[PDB]
Amino acid sequence: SMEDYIEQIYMLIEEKGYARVSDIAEALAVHPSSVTKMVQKLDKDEYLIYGLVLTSKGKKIGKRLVYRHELLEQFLRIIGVDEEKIYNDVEGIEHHLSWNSIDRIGDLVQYFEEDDARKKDLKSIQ
C-alpha cells in the first residue's frame, strides 16, 4: 500500500497543489485514520514531511509510479484491451512487475507508436 499512497499523494499535489488527508482517504477508499497511520510511516521512511510535502525521495518515486501507471494503460490500450477493463487491469499488475518488464513494455509501446502499420498488422491478427 506504500506505493499506492505515494502515487496518490503525488497525483493530488500535481492536481491541486496539496494533499489533504480527506482527499487521500477518498481516492484510496479508506478511513482517514488509516491515512494518518500510513503518513506517519512515510514520514519515518523520509518520503514526506508535514501540510503534506514530498521529499525529493518521495517525489522521484511518485513520478516513477505515475509513469508506470500511464505506460501500462497505454500498453493495454495499444494491444486493444477494452478501455473499460484497462484501469482495473493496470492497478492489479502495476506494482508486481520488475523494472526490466516495465522497461521492455516501454520499448514495445514505442515499437507500435513508431509506425502505425505495426498497429494495423496487430489488428489484423485479431
Q: Which residues are annotated as a binding site for Mn(2+)?
A: 4, 7, 69, 91, 94-95
CB atoms within 10 A of CB 78: 16
**Alpha-carbon 103 to chain mean position:** 15
Is 64 near Fe ion (CB under 5 A)?
A: no
CA-nearest of 117, 7, 124, 125 to 72 is 7
Task: Tell the smallest beta-carbon distance from residue 113 to a copy of itself (Å).
Answer: 9
Cell 520488475, located at residue: 98
Question: Any contact of residue 89 with Fe ion (CB under 5 A)?
Answer: no
Nearer Cβ to Fe ion (41/119): 41
69 near Fe ion, judged by CB under 5 A? yes
The partner residues of 54 in beta bridges, in order of sequence, read 48
Q: Which does 4 bind (CB under 5 to 8 A by kind): a copy of itself, Fe ion, none?
A: Fe ion
Distance between CA atoms of residues 70 and 113, nearest Å: 15
The least CB distance from residue 91 to Fe ion, in Å, is 5
CB of 126 to a copy of itself, least distance (A): 5
